[model samples]
Target: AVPYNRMKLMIVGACGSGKTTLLQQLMKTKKTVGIDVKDWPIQIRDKRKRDLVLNVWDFAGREEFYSTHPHFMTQRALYLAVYDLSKGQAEVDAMKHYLFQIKARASSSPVILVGTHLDVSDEAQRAAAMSKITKELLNKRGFPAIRDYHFVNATEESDALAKLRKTIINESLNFKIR
Candidate 1:
């Protein structure tokens, strides 16, 4: 028998940012469009073995849909805030806005920024673009500093997913430690 812990997680971002794609990749299964709350069983084995039953909540990134879904946000959960790297400033601002909403609603939770669509741009260009946006957000006086950030091409099942899983395990462990 395997022992495990549980976690509540929310994947949030702008419309068409590939939040659904990433979730599908992480779960290795199909999902419906728009709002969904599903059980994502993530096995986290550190010094101790445990299955992580993630109460994964996914929101429709469309403004009209998510704007009225504040009731769905909860405190103390893990947050994976995503953005599309291929888009320009508009998308960056939208991602920032989502972060603000998440912080306001789930103040105690940790939010890690996830950048998708990296395959559409060159590494240098992507880094430059991401740097500008991160700096912009960092300058914001009251915005919470993000836990970490990762750039991934959600279309491919690659190292990015493994890195993301490792991040989750590390974050979960740290959260438990603290």
Candidate 2:
């Protein structure tokens, strides 16, 4: 029998920023959409003898959905704050706004910043967005502590996806995979 090691990876961001597409790629399967929670069972180890039941929250960016299921967000887990740099300052504002809200709700957990839609923007464009985001979010006082910022295509086996997983793995050890 396998033991249980459950935690969550939440993808929070603007609507149509390719959140669904990213979830599809992460699970390495075809697309599925809705305002439902997900379960990703990770084979953390057999020798150590534990299985990770990682619940992924791909919650829609609508007000109604959030109100529908309020309690689940309180579960302390690694937060993936997604954004699309192509939207310029609009994306920037949403990042700061949403992350702060998450911090307010979750009471300070491991948070990671992920910029999606990598295939659409140029290097300079992304660089500016990176600096812009870094300057805006990380530089702010009392803001949520987002240790790393990542950009993913959300449709490929991007290394960013692996690094995103790395954040969870590191944090998982800290919280007993909470």
Candidate 3:
């Protein structure tokens, strides 16, 4: 397997959508103010079974920030489009808004769709949620930008976070720039 030393990741979602919660879960700390480097940094292991640095840019999911997010999508970055599944069907449409933002200034880089509040939701809800989003993406450039989906309960230590971390590593390798 090819070895990589680094990758860039963006956490894009609406405010109060648990971006920081996931960031803290990932960092075990850290809000992030406009790609604040002081708060955004991480280390991950790839298939090489070695530790590699991962640069994180946890964006404040708001209108004021979306316009500038596109500039950060470089050649070796990945995206995390998060939404609150516990919020019900409304969150599905909100996710599309963020995904479209990524697609608008898009990159060849892959995006990962994340749904938080898994502890509060159930299997049926998760199934219905993605299906609704999938159904809506019918004739649009919707799903192409995203390479995977992860559901997690960032508040508590859940197996989902580990799965998500591995998925990120896996995707990074598949889309590595060099």
Candidate 4:
């Protein structure tokens, strides 16, 4: 029998949102630094286990990549969509494109929208920006009726680790998936 719950977590976002860094930190090993997803399994304690063998596909968020491989957006797994909050309103449209095509398409699956690069902005600023973007993305979706969210600065190990754990825990609670 499988010992884990097979949680499919797919990270999606534009470039520089720290998705790769977050992925590395969660795995608790070096980022692509001799680490491979082939052997990793998401485990909580004996109390609960998530078969979170991440199909951690690092899709290049560059416009070139988006135009080149539109199929990447069709992944039917839970999504951890990250984005820059400091840029303000400039990223609104691009943000929607990701949520609608990537996150929302798998609406049945959970979606955790994380606003990255929050170090440059104050807490209030980050919270406000993320709230707006999330609302726009999940407006009609019944899931995040409360808007589950998080902020990350991958450069800081502690901050990244704490937020990563928080994101996973919140996801577990939000969907009762555990």
Best by TM-score: 1
- lDDT ranking, best first: 1, 3, 2, 4
Which segments of model 2 are wrong by more than 4 Å?
1-4, 29-73, 175-178
In model 1, what is the error at residue 70, expressed in angstroms?
20
Better of 2 and 3 by lDDT: 3
Q: How high is the lDDT of residue 162 in model 4?
A: 81
On the 0 to 100 scale, the lDDT of residue 111 in model 2 is: 74
Writing each residue's lDDT as its tens digit, candidate 2 over 1-178 gives 1124445567788887777887777774421125667788877667877787888767556576445445444457677788876666568677777777876877666677777877887787688878877777874765777767888888788678877667657865665533
What is the lDDT of every predicted structure here?
Answer: 0.73, 0.71, 0.72, 0.60
Question: Residue-wise lDDT of candidate 3 within 73-142, one digit each (tens)?
Answer: 4634688888888887788787777677666665465788888988899888888887886677534554
> Which 10 successive residues of model 1 have the least lDDT summed?
65-74
Q: Give model 3's TM-score versus the native structure.
A: 0.66
Quality of model 4 by C-alpha lDDT: 0.60
* CA RMSD, predictions in order: 15.6, 15.3, 15.0, 15.5
Show the lowest summed lDDT stretch of 10 residues, model 3.
31-40
Stretches of candidate 1 exceeding 4 Å from the true structure: 1-4, 29-73, 138-140
Q: Which stretches of candidate 3 lie over 4 Å from their true place?
A: 1-4, 28-76, 122-124, 137-143
Two-way lDDT contest, 1 vs 4, winner: 1
Candidate 2 lDDT score at position 61:
67
TM-score of each: 0.67, 0.66, 0.66, 0.58
TM-score, cand. 1 vs. native = 0.67
Candidate 3 lDDT:
0.72
